């Protein structure tokens, strides 16, 4: 790897600098190098990894959606038959997105997840696994679309089981996991009722646990609860 000659601490420092500079491809390369040093990641380091790749894949997803919309318009009735270009370029972006997802899933499988024994780390990584299979599912067509979807579901389900046993209902990792699993149900798995049920149960069980929290933990939890509320409002 191109980062193999750089110190772990230096990679982490440079990832923080790249975040400040909004240089998220750099940030992801630095954190990939940090992961490949072979040591477990701290909480802060896990967050840096997540921020970097979420911003990278977020740009690709936004571009893929613009291009997919143009492509489907060009297949409507009454549309001038352009050439292969729109499809080609949507495929180019799609292939780069899949590469980023495969890279993240490779880091989790080699060997972040198997070395994660604390609930906060293991749930964080398993949620990540679900998320990046969900991004693959967004662009998947049917051949292995079913198996991609079941791979996302499996990872989210394992994370949910641990989080319910090991974390309180207000824990922000638990909340973000349930939020994203609910989006999976609604947008990927064609299960809007499961999405709505999960979002409402999650919200209500967190609400009943807020009284145990400090002002700072209260702010973190209610932030993600509001996203659950926002989706319920969109979905109902």
């Amino acid at each position: 790897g191109a980062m193999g000659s750089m110190e772990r601490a230096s990679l982490i420092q440079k990832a923080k600098l790249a975040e400040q500079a909004e240089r998220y491809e750099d940030m992801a390369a630095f954190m990939k190098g940090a992961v490949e040093k072979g040591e477990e990641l701290s909480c802060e380091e896990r967050n840096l990894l997540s921020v970097a790749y979420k911003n990278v894949v977020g740009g690709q997803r936004a571009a893929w959606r613009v291009l997919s919309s143009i492509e489907q318009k060009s297949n409507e009735e009454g549309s001038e038959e352009k050439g292969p270009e729109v499809r080609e370029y949507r495929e180019k972006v799609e292939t780069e997105l899949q590469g980023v997802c495969d890279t993240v899933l490779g880091l989790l499988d080699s060997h972040l997840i198997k070395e994660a024994g604390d609930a906060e780390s293991r749930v964080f990584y398993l949620k990540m696994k679900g998320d990046y299979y969900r991004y693959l599912a967004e662009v998947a067509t049917g051949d292995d679309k079913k198996r991609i979807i079941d791979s996302a579901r499996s990872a989210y389900q394992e994370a949910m089981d641990i989080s319910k046993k090991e974390m309180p209902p207000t824990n922000p990792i638990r909340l973000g996991l349930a939020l994203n699993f609910s989006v999976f149900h609604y947008e990927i798995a064609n299960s809007p009722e499961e999405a709505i049920s999960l979002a409402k149960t999650t919200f209500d069980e967190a609400m009943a646990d807020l009284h145990t929290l400090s002002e700072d933990s209260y702010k973190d939890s209610t932030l993600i609860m509001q996203l659950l509320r926002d989706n319920l409002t969109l979905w109902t």
């Binding site: 964080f124 909340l175 989006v183």
Partner: peptide
């Protein structure tokens, strides 16, 4: 259109 979780958590 659905909101998903921010990258950074607890």
């Amino acid at each position: 259109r659905s909101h998903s979780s921010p990258a950074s958590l607890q």
